[model samples]
Target: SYEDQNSLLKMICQQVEAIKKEMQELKLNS
Candidate 1:
């Protein structure tokens, strides 16, 4: 259960990083 939780957290972190990168790009363009 602990391993699963770590995996899930890593996936969520990756997604958040990707979103933040996209937002930064959008701000630069604007």
Candidate 2:
């Protein structure tokens, strides 16, 4: 159960980081 939670959180963290990078790129373009 703990491993499942950790894996889920890691996935969400990667998604958040990817989104953050996209926002930074948009800002640079603007």
Candidate 3:
């Protein structure tokens, strides 16, 4: 159960990083 929760947390962090990168690129273009 702990391993599963840690995996999910990692997934969420990756998703947040992806979104942040996308927003940064968009800001540069605009």
Candidate 4:
């Protein structure tokens, strides 16, 4: 059960990182 929770959290973190990266790039272009 803990392992599954950890995997889900990791997935969310990766998505957050991806969004942050995209936002940073957008700022550079603007």
Better of 2 and 4 by lDDT: 2
- Across 1-30, the per-residue lDDT of candidate 3 in tens digits comes to 999999999999999999999999999999
Q: Better model by TM-score, 2 or 4?
A: 2
lDDT of 1 by residue, 1-30 (tens): 999999999999999999999999999999
> Which model is ahead, 1 or 3, in terms of TM-score?
3
Can you tell me which runs of candidate 3 are displaced by over 4 Å?
none
Q: In order, how many clashes per candidate? A: 0, 0, 0, 0
Q: How close is candidate 1 to the true structure, as a TM-score?
A: 0.81
Best by TM-score: 3
TM-score of each model, paired residue for residue? 0.81, 0.81, 0.84, 0.76
TM match of model 4 to true structure: 0.76
**Which residue ranges in model 1 land beyond 4 Å of their true spot?**
none
Tens digit per residue, CA lDDT, model 4, 1-30: 999999999999999999999999999999
What is the alpha-carbon lDDT of model 2 when measured against the actual structure?
1.00
RMSD (CA, Å), each prediction: 0.6, 0.7, 0.6, 0.8
